[PDB]
Nucleic acid binder design. Sequence first.
RNA 1: UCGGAGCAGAACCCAACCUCCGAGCAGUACAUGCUAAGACUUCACCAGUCAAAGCGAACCUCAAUUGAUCCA
RNA 2: AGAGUGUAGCUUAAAAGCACCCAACUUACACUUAGGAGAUUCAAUUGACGCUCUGA
Lengths: 98, 325, 133
Amino acid sequence: QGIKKMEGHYVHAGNIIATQRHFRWHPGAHVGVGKNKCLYALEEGIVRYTKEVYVPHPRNTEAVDLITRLPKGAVLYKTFVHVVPAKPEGTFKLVAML
Amino acid sequence: RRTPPLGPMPNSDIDLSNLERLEKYRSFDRYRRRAEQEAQAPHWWRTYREYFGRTQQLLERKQAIQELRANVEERAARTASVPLDAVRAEWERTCGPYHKQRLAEYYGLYRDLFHGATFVPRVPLHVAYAVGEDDLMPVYCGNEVTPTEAAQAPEVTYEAELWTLLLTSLDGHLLEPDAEYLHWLLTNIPGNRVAEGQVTCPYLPPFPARGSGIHRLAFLLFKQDQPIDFSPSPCYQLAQRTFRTFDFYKKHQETMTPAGLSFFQCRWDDSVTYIFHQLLDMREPVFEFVRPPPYHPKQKRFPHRQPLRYLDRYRDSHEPTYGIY
Amino acid sequence: AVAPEFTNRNPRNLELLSVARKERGWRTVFPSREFWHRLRVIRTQHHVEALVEHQNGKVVVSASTREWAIKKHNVVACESIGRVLAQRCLEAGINFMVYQPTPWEAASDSMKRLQSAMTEGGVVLREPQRIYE
RNA sequence: UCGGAGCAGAACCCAACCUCCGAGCAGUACAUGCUAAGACUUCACCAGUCAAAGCGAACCUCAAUUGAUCCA
RNA sequence: AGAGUGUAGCUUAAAAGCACCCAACUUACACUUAGGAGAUUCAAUUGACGCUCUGA
Ligand SMILES: [Mg+2]
């Protein structure tokens, strides 16, 4: 296991980015994931890593208990994998002059 | 080797000898507030933003709040009406400038038309588009109006007493980008009378092309200290109407500062095509808004374990055949 | 004299057409960043702020109790602020929102009253789909 | 070969050809949905797997009851 | 008599945020939801009104 593609490498959408058991790799912008806890590309562009504080969903109650167990001055931080889209979504081209 | 953090590591100082003596995030809102306070900082380990990003008035307000509490008492709370008209009027009177500057920055009007230099509009200006007799369509900062309803010139209100009103579409239609299509040009308006000032460019209707997204048209009035000359008569030429507001503000609006702005969206409609055919005397263009195509994978000699879709990627389509009839 | 690539420069064109792209990931962290216009409310003692942030975080419109304009004439205050923000969004042209509070804040009656006032003003917190291809 | 009570009285462990109950089980099932990009490849194929966007929903009992490769 | 002096308890706030307390769920605590109570001491950058310390 591990990161399949290094950050900054151009990768198409759906390509495997980072696979891990116990989530060492966290999701950033445009980073899909399924039941296998692996990170995959959701868009074409350049991969980057960012150390940003992770706040769990309210559905996770054990994570809520752990965050409560963390101090008020304690900050978690986590390495998320953002996918900056290189190409644009689309462009308007002049069809015809009726 | 071993890379540690370049700046101060997180959760370093708050540890101390007595970890149990920490106050701890008993409330989840407290931890969220601390995390948001940390996220407001730019930090040294990079982030997503690294890659992507009076006393008398106070006493009067206190007396008003005390009177409101006495009128409520409690009983009205146990559901106050709080009419939004007076609140909106007071907000436009007191704190409308910061929100107006925020809206102008969000629309990119100052960055495009004025090439930057955003300012808080002191004069509160709202437009009224004439649609029949009653009522008039209200146009605030960002209020959308279709080209069909915007065939005629609209009225404007600012509650002020020289002035110079102009209208420019910052979308850069037809011609090259980084330009705005001028629509109207009122200059040297005496007092609130906009008709007192001369009209250099007569008011033209909006002409947004089909399928070109949304267009941004802004009408702006600036505070004028002294009246100045201008210059283009009623013309349908697109070359004369093409002008940037930054260049006009830089080397011509020396003794002039902005006072008020109103933004609006513009889309293709029947009146846009009518103006294109009759007034512009040209064929109306239509835009496609087309996305990029698939890259398509690399073609090899054999499909290997893949299904039948491997050998049919990089041509087109549906009925092609064999050697020759 | 019409260019082949006509590029209109309205900032809200892609969001109104829903073609504005969103960060598909960041699913582990809460809240997710996959939204166009997100209603972010910060409730504090007495005064409570309420902004509408874009994907970049551009909070264009704010409506808080500290504005000192509506100070004349709380869940009722939350409903009034929601109605005022709905009127401001209708003036500015906003109809698609993303209200994602905490489940405790979701259970809050102040948030429910504010959302009801926003729906009465004509602001939908639905975040419609971008429509692929 | 494996568990429950005491020896082993209050986070673990603890010993006896120690003191007593037990076990080689039994009973009950086989959204555990459809569709759909983009990837892994048993070094061919076959066989297998991961999974983004969409439609349609939520939001095993037991007390032990067992063991290992190897050749079948 | 002198020094330090001044936003509710706290603020390298300019009238906000942390804090106060009440209830319901809590054995209880905590959280959450609903609440409200809360301050730049007064006169023209200056003066005094209020307190701590040093004295008597
Ligand atoms: Mg990987």
